[PDB]
UniProtKB/Swiss-Prot annotation, chain A:
<comment type="subunit">
    <text>The RNAP catalytic core consists of 2 alpha, 1 beta, 1 beta' and 1 omega subunit. When a sigma factor is associated with the core the holoenzyme is formed, which can initiate transcription.</text>
</comment>
<comment type="function">
    <text>DNA-dependent RNA polymerase catalyzes the transcription of DNA into RNA using the four ribonucleoside triphosphates as substrates.</text>
</comment>
<comment type="similarity">
    <text>Belongs to the RNA polymerase beta chain family.</text>
</comment>
<protein>
    <recommendedName>
        <fullName>DNA-directed RNA polymerase subunit beta</fullName>
    </recommendedName>
</protein>
Swiss-Prot record, chain B:
<comment type="subunit">
    <text>Homodimer. The RNAP catalytic core consists of 2 alpha, 1 beta, 1 beta' and 1 omega subunit. When a sigma factor is associated with the core the holoenzyme is formed, which can initiate transcription.</text>
</comment>
<comment type="similarity">
    <text>Belongs to the RNA polymerase alpha chain family.</text>
</comment>
<comment type="function">
    <text>DNA-dependent RNA polymerase catalyzes the transcription of DNA into RNA using the four ribonucleoside triphosphates as substrates.</text>
</comment>
<protein>
    <recommendedName>
        <fullName>DNA-directed RNA polymerase subunit alpha</fullName>
    </recommendedName>
</protein>
Length: 52, 58
């Protein structure tokens, strides 16, 4: 609790800093760069449905 | 579930050479299920007539 109560001092002057986290999921889409361990590279042209 | 109804069929037509059937709407994979299905029909099976054999009497 000591660490929780007084361990919040950050920078001289600005002792009150509010840090907010913003989680943003980023997916795979036409334009992503995919590769392999072996060295081959690649960029998805048009991710087609599994129908094709 | 929802469904779509094919409308706005803008038939670009020229007498006998070609017809270009413009038409909406098609979700991902329908201009395929239909387009390729039609070319399949037009290269393999279309009940019509033609000359099967010709003997040149000469």
């Amino acid at each position: 609790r000591r660490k929780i109560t007084q361990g919040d001092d950050l920078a001289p002057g600005v002792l009150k800093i509010v840090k907010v986290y913003l989680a943003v999921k980023r997916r795979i889409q036409p334009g992503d760069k995919m590769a392999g361990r072996h060295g081959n590279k690649g960029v998805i042209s048009k991710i087609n449905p599994i129908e094709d | 579930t929802e469904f779509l109804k094919p409308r706005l069929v803008d038939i670009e037509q020229v007498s006998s050479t070609h017809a270009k059937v413009t038409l909406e709407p098609l979700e991902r994979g329908f201009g395929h299920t239909l387009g390729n299905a039609l070319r399949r029909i037009l290269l393999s099976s279309m009940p019509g007539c033609a000359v099967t054999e010709v003997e040149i009497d000469g």
